[PDB]
């Protein structure tokens, strides 16, 4: 029980600012050899409060953007532990009920392209990504009423390849939900704004291949074509790069994306 007593001490060391930075570092490294880490974090005294504290304490560094690598590494260790809590079946619902993702949205709103901020956005995205991976509909309901879709769309347009991929994955999960699809296609303005961004991404992908990103972009289009109004609009504004041989090379390895693409073209008839 020597390794596990080492986990308990670190958890207990998160409460005091004196010992927290080191505890954050060590715990974040062990979160995939300790299956029950999330409920121990959630249900211990003051632990989640300490992680929120870590988050809010870098708010003065967001605007003007002065966040350093050291600050970013530290809060990202805290974000790594919240991702762990977001993923676990036993803590996901309580995490959502406490509206903890709202304290991440200021990070997602940043636009600075320095490495400390890109890492901050990617890691924050990873928390939301862990939430929607579990495919609960309570999660999509929460996201829809908290306006994370514009946050994701801005990132899909302007972020690093990694951030664009996580952000598009979140959009994909929202769209796959019946409620999410209806929300995004409720007005032409909403639909159009999403279609426009996806269109820009396809152009970018044709210049700079990213198999993972292309896969999610294609999925999003395919799901959008399930909506009749969106289907008709897509018959007009679907990028020519998705109809011709542009991606034929990079796709002959990806059978799943090819099948999705062919389903998409098929649908638009």
């Amino acid at each position: 029980q020597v390794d596990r007593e080492k986990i308990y001490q670190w958890i207990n060391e998160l409460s005091s600012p004196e010992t927290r930075e080191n505890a954050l570092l060590e715990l974040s490294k062990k979160r995939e050899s300790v299956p029950d880490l999330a409920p121990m974090l959630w249900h211990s005294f003051g632990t989640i409060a300490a992680l929120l504290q870590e988050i809010v304490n870098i708010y003065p560094s967001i605007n003007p953007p002065t966040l350093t690598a050291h600050q970013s590494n530290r809060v990202c260790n805290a974000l790594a532990l919240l991702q762990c809590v977001a993923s676990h079946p036993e803590t996901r619902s309580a995490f959502l009920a406490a509206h903890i993702p709202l304290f991440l949205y200021p990070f997602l709103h940043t636009v600075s392209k320095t490495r400390p901020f890109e890492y901050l956005r990617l890691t924050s995205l990873g928390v939301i990504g862990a939430l929607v991976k579990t495919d609960e509909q309570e999660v999509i309901n929460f996201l829809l009423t908290t306006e994370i879709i514009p946050l994701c769309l801005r990132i899909m347009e302007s972020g690093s390849e990694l951030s664009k991929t996580v952000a598009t994955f979140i959009l994909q999960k929202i769209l796959l939900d019946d409620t999410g699809l209806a929300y995004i296609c409720q007005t032409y303005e909403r639909f159009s704004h999403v279609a426009m961004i996806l269109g820009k991404m396809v152009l970018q992908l044709s210049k700079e291949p990213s198999a993972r990103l292309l896969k999610h972009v294609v999925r999003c289009y395919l799901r959008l074509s399930d909506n009749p109004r969106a289907r008709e609009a897509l018959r007009q504004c679907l990028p020519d790069q998705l109809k011709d041989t542009t991606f034929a090379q990079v796709l002959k390895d990806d059978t799943t994306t090819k099948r999705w693409l062919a389903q998409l073209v098929k649908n638009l008839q």
Partner: protein, 237 residues
């Protein structure tokens, strides 16, 4: 690197007049070198910006912070039969998370609003303008907004912090009522679900105790009181 300019008590929030002594006018601003009289319109521009933004920012920040603070405090103090420690912890956390959300919320709108107000005041004063002075105007307005945003934001944060406390007291009323009603029946309130989970499932070293939380475990909550974002931390004075 940059520390907060102000401590929580450097700014009086009772009226907009609390802003005046802290306003900063960079004398090298080209618009000001050319027309020194235009400095006199800056105070009112900032006051109006804060005036139009303070209530929406305050309401939004408290709304965002409330649910998170209530849920986390309810969770942490579930086995605590006393209302006192819980009330104080909630007070400190809510004030802190409200101040944080207020800072994030008001920054960009303050810049936009302070700048618009100045450019408007500058243009009306002198005179009709011109393409080479309208650029001095736009330059001046943007810079002044940058120079006074921290001040305006702190005013609004503090307004929100002061309103947050009593709002939290009201939200935790039923938690206070659970404990008080229990004490009337001669017993200590203990959330039965939490009591079972902690006794049966949590490792001893991190288990919530019936016996209570020991003082050094409160370090998180005390830190919320010491270190409020946007303000110089407190100390032995």
């Amino acid at each position: 690197p940059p520390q907060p300019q102000y401590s929580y008590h450097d700014i009086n929030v009772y009226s907009l007049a609390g802003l005046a002594p802290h306003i900063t006018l960079n004398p090298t601003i080209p618009l000001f070198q050319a027309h020194p009289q235009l400095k006199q319109c800056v105070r009112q521009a900032i006051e109006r910006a804060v005036q139009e933004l303070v209530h929406p920012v305050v309401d939004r920040s408290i709304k965002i912070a409330m649910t998170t603070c209530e849920q986390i405090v309810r969770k942490d103090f579930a086995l605590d039969s006393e209302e006192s420690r819980m009330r104080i912890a909630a007070h400190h956390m809510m004030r802190n998370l409200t101040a944080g959300m207020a800072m994030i919320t008001c920054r960009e709108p303050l810049l936009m609003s302070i700048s618009t107000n100045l450019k408007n005041s500058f243009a009306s004063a002198l005179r009709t303008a011109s393409p080479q002075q309208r650029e001095m105007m736009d330059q001046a307005a943007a810079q002044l907004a940058q120079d006074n945003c921290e001040l305006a934001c702190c005013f609004i944060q503090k307004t929100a912090v002061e309103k947050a406390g009593p709002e939290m007291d009201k939200r935790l009323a039923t938690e206070f009522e659970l404990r008080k009603h229990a004490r009337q029946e001669g017993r200590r309130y203990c959330d039965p679900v939490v009591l079972t989970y902690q006794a049966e499932r949590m490792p001893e070293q991190i288990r919530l105790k019936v016996g209570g939380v020991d003082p050094k475990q409160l370090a998180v909550y005390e830190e919320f009181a010491r270190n409020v974002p946007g303000f110089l931390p407190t100390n032995d004075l």
